Amino acid sequence: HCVILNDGNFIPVLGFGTALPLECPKSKAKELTKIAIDAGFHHFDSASVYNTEDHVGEAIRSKIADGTVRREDIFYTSKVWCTSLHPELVRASLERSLQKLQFDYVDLYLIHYPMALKPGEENFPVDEHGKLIFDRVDLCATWEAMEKCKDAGLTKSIGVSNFNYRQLEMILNKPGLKYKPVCNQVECHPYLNQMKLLDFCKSKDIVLVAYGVLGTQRYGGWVDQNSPVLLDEPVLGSMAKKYNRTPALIALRYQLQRGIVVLNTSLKEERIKENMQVFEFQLSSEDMKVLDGLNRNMRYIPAAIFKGHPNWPFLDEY
Ligand SMILES: NC(=O)C1=CN([C@@H]2O[C@H](COP(=O)(O)OP(=O)(O)OC[C@H]3O[C@@H](n4cnc5c(N)ncnc54)[C@H](OP(=O)(O)O)[C@@H]3O)[C@@H](O)[C@H]2O)C=CC1
Does CATH place domain 1-318 in 3.20.20.100? Predict the structure, then answer.
């Protein structure tokens, strides 16, 4: 179950996300990755800022070493963080991730956010008022650095995350552009269906990879705890009953039928296994329209601490 990227490489349409809630120890990522591999997942999504690439890498290497899977059958994604967007720092960050993973290459490397922060070891540099210290970077130069990483064989494909249409255009219209982003990883679910951005990405052969498909893990410090819980949506419950599935399976299938590559995370083995059942049924065209009607511009992860940044991506309509 894969789709072909604009650079010729293949990506599994269902991926397991390795980000964790604030209360979980980093080692949890190793445990879950092993469970996900046993459940049939081949696509794993990580990021340098998660600081658990070492744990995910150990899980994958353990399953390769014991005969469960081969490296070529695993699709691993990492992302360069805001503090390393400067052109001269991009490759250094990827090389650091490769060392943590003890991998020769990653399958996909993304710009995590189109917003640079003061360079340094600290991922969230702040001033004396507790405000993030923004930095200005030539994102087209950042992209050129990403292209060099691909040409150096450190990553098979390159893309972006949390970019809006104008930011994608900046790259697409860049003079000397060699590789278009293969994807734009953004938040997407029935309450924020990204109809406009999805249409734009499709017209440019850019795959939309979705997170928050099940409403996000509601991370403390990022998600408003008073926001509605997506899977509690009555329409998803009614549809789950109709198709004899679960609200989560309905939400996952909705996105797959829109041509979206979906990420998902669960701390429970039973659910990790259940989610693989999304390939077993089809939502009718009429029911897809019912789910299209739930849009309400509910953005669970607005990256609020970045508000004020000249490149905050969520101000524009899309
Ligand atoms: N690029 C970016 O900016 C970001 C990327 N991500 C990526 O997206 C991945 C997915 O995470 P996220 O979007 O937060 O979360 P999801 O929307 O994928 O999941 C939200 C919740 O769904 C629950 N859930 C999962 N499966 C089931 C099921 N079968 N039945 C009932 N409940 C279920 C989980 O709860 P429980 O664990 O209790 O089962 C989980 O807390 C991350 O790990 C990361 O890789 C995340 C945030 C930002």
Answer: yes
